[PDB]
Amino acid sequence: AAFVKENHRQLQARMGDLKGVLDDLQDNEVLTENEKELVEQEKTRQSKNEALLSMVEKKGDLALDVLFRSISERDPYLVSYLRQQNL
Amino acid sequence: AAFVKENHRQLQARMGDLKGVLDDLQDNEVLTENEKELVEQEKTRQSKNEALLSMVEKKGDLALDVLFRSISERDPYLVSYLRQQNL
Amino acid sequence: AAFVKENHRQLQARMGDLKGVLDDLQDNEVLTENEKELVEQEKTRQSKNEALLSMVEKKGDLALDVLFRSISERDPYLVSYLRQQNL
Amino acid sequence: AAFVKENHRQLQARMGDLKGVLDDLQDNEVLTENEKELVEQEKTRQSKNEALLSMVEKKGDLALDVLFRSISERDPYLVSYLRQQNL
Amino acid sequence: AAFVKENHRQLQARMGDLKGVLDDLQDNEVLTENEKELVEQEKTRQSKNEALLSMVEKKGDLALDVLFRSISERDPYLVSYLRQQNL
Amino acid sequence: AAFVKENHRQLQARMGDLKGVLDDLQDNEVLTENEKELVEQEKTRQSKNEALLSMVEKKGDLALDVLFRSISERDPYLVSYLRQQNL
Amino acid sequence: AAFVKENHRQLQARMGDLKGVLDDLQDNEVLTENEKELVEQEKTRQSKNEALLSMVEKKGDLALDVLFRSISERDPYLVSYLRQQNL
Amino acid sequence: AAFVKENHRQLQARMGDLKGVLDDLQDNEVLTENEKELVEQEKTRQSKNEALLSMVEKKGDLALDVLFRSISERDPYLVSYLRQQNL
Amino acid sequence: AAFVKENHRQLQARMGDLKGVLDDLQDNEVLTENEKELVEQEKTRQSKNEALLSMVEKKGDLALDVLFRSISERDPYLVSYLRQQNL
Amino acid sequence: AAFVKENHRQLQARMGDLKGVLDDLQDNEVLTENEKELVEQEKTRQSKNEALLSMVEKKGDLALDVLFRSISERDPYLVSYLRQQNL
Amino acid sequence: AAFVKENHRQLQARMGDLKGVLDDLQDNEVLTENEKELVEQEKTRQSKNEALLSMVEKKGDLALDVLFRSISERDPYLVSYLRQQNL
Amino acid sequence: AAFVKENHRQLQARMGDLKGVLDDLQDNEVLTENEKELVEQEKTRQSKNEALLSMVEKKGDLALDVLFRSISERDPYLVSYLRQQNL
């Protein structure tokens, strides 16, 4: 959870395609259908990432954990990238 | 990695057919199937190269290194060409 | 290399059968198998010559030199012919 | 008419594309052009369905009947589905 | 019907070419022409499968049964595959 | 099944003419006519092998077994060759 | 003009490809380039026909006459078809 | 000017896209950028036309004349249409 | 006309080469050059049959009659075959 | 230039294969590689001619002159044909 | 800069493909990524040109000079065209 | 700070998109979320810039300095533009 909040800007920049991430968060009841649609409405990837992160952080730490695992599985070079840049 | 960013325009122009490169990047889990298809959607080789380079730079340095080695194996006259033109 | 670019149209018209030239460029790793096949797909000799020349120019100066030497050995009246017409 | 009010929530969820239904209601002078446009402005299908149903219910029983026949013709598995779920 | 909902992700992945299935669903009036066109608009097979499944689930149980029988006739190795993986 | 997936690249390279294999898979209802035609559309043998293998893996383990037996009967030096190279 | 308004729904269904009709209406200064592009933006033929008809009716009777003559020249079986169905 | 005031309702209905008209009125300093944006904010074409007409009438007769010439150039069937219907 | 609609699927399967039929339909001004080319674009015979039938049915009964006579002259075993299978 | 604009439709119909003309326009820097590819994307000769003419007219009179001379060299019966039909 | 402002309307009409120009302005730090995306969102070339010109004028004279040089390099017949029409 | 106050009108006209600037001011705790949303409510860019400037000036000199550095990083041609025009 802390890792996600501290890297909010970089995740806003480098998260990438959220379709699979949105699918994961929808399978775990973290997001409703309406919320996912609201995330898909955004025009650019930066706005999509901003909306998704800002909405997930509110719900609690568990949602941040599910988001962290989903992003970790989807792309293994970005968690490692930010983990190395924070060092 | 730096070599790829500095030669972004020239690689955008002269990379050529990515099918083997796309196969390498997919075997190393740098790209998903969805991402590879999104790269293949483009109409021209210039747009394909633009999409591939722009997406690979985002992921991190390791992806740039794998891309550099794969392109180096695929064509030895372009790595030598750019290496000579930078001199 | 410059000689090849300057006579692009005339080489497009008068190069002729590329099978031996394609064999040379393939032995020197200038072309892959896929690229040679793509050159062989073209229907007429003008399109074959156009594809081969346009692809060789992209790779770099070394490829143009290998192509020039291969064409020079394969046919001695075309290098001499163009060399005389440029005068 | 009663069937529409009693199943308002389920119709809000499962009506689907209203373009044909909106065309029917416009041909029968139940809706004006402005009202149809206002229904199409909504962002999601749930909001479109809610707006359309809420606007049709006010007008009267006859409008509800026209809506029921139009929806019945458009999709035959939804009237039968809801008729079975009410049992 | 339950079999389709429980295997939503796997069917989303492995359904394949929908032309014959879409033809069946159009012959059985489960889908209109507009809906079939909207399913064919998608760029990849994963998105086509997602749209088709999500739209079929909405209509009701009968549509889910027709989809199950149509997929069963079209490909006998996928119904058998999922039936074996659920065991 | 594992033998086919692990050697996907080598089978992609050395399988050869698929007409007999496609005939086998068509007689066993693993492939439809449309799928066989789509495999035959490809221009090169590498693309034909890639399409066929990628489509067969999706269907399930039984299809992979039929593919292995068909390739084994068609050419006995390729199953033995790959079995020897994995050692 | 009256024939076009009275057959609005049927023309919405059966007009077909508008490219030639749009070219005619553009040659007669009934539509601008922007308007033709807006008609071409639509996804399906039904939406294209709906937009075109709705835009042509607005401008006046002369535009409806030009549309009737252009459609009459382009396809002679549809004017005869609707003319027969109104009888 | 009088023609515009007397046909306020019909112009409110049939004026259409104002982007070109707004561009003309902006080139002639009849409207500022802020006013044009205020016209573009409206949701429907009827409200846009109402806002534009109501704003132009206040400014004076010359603005109404410029509006008349701009509408005359933009669409030649609507000025002729209203002129014929007023007869 | 009815015979064509009732046997739409079987004609989709067994019509075969349309070149002569397309020639007839072009001689009778039922199809334009563009439409014939659009039918010829399809990759398989099933898709060609689908495009041709779907386009001919739209135009009207006369086009279906011309299609019936042309196919009847081209092949006398398919009209007889379907006429026998409907019995 | 005027000859080209006035006969836009006839050139749109009868120009034919543009490969040589495209080569000329590419040699004179009237078209880039991207523009030539965009012209080559079209499916039919009518669409290719429409794209080429519409793009060349935009650039200016000089481009129209180069196009007229190139078409004049490629085919001497079409310039003479249109020159005779305008008389 | 003055040349760009004075020819604002004609440049809005005749600028053409902006991909290369956008590449220039992005390489020279005149535009951010968000701004380039906002320029690419527009539907037509007229709206793209309107957004691009209106945004470039705001930044200052230096941006206008860079834009003028980029447009000059991209197309040499349009700067000459406007230069000749202004005379 | 003085540079910001003296160019308040010009910054009101030419600041542009504040999303990045708002992000900076929010990262530096100059603005809360509520204030950023209140700035985003405004209808035009002129009103957004007016609200942002008017709110930042009140808070103090440090906020004006952070605003100057953020605008300097966001756009390097506007700080140079105003600095040159004040000369």
Numbering used by the authors:
A (entry chain G), B (entry chain K), C (entry chain D), D (entry chain H), E (entry chain J), F (entry chain L), ...: 451 to 537
Quote the study on this structure.
Many NLR proteins nucleate the “inflammasome”—a large macromolecular complex that triggers inflammatory cell death and cytokine secretion in response to microbial or danger-associated ligands. Like many other supramolecular assemblies in the human innate immune system, the inflammasome complex relies on homotypic and heterotypic interactions between the death domains (DDs) to initiate, amplify, and propagate pyroptotic signaling. Inflammasome sensor NLRs can be grouped into two categories based on their DDs: PYRIN domain (PYD) and caspase activation and recruitment domain (CARD), both domains were found to form filamentous complexes to initiate the inflammasome formation. Extending this analysis, we also found that specific type II interface motifs directly dictate the compatibility of heterotypic pairwise CARD-CARD interactions among NLRP1, CARD8, NLRC4, ASC, and CASP1.
To test this, we solved the structures of recombinant NLRP1-CARD and CARD8-CARD filaments using cryo-EM, both at 3.7 Å with Gold standard FSC = 0.143, without masking. Similar to NLRP1-CARD, recombinant CARD8-CARD also formed ~8 nm-wide filaments, but these filaments are more rigid and adopt a single conformation. NLRP1-CARD and CARD8-CARD filaments display similar helical parameters (5.36 Å and −100.8 degree for NLRP1, and 5.409 Å and −99.16 degree for CARD8), suggesting a similar mode of assembly from the respective monomers. Despite near-identical helical parameters, NLRP1-CARD and CARD8-CARD filaments have remarkably different surface charge distributions, that are not suggested by their monomer structures alone. By contrast, in CARD8-CARD filaments, the positively charged patches on the monomer are mostly buried inside the filamentous oligomer, exposing a predominantly negative surface. In contrast, the CARD8 Type IIb surface is partially negatively charged (Tyr531, Tyr527, and Asp525), whereas the Type IIa surface is positive (Lys508, Lys509, and Leu512). Hence, CARD8-CARD is structurally compatible with CASP1-CARD but not ASC-CARD. In agreement with the structural predictions, CARD8-CARD, but not NLRP1-CARD, preferentially stimulated CASP1-CARD oligomerization, as demonstrated by the appearance of slower migrating bands on native gels (lanes 2 and 3 vs. 4 and 5), whereas the reverse was true for ASC-CARD oligomerization (lanes 2 and 3 vs. lanes 4 and 5). We further corroborated that CARD8 is the first human inflammasome sensor that is unable to engage ASC as an amplifier. In contrast, CARD8-dependent pyroptosis was not abrogated in ASC (PYCARD) KO keratinocytes (blue bars).
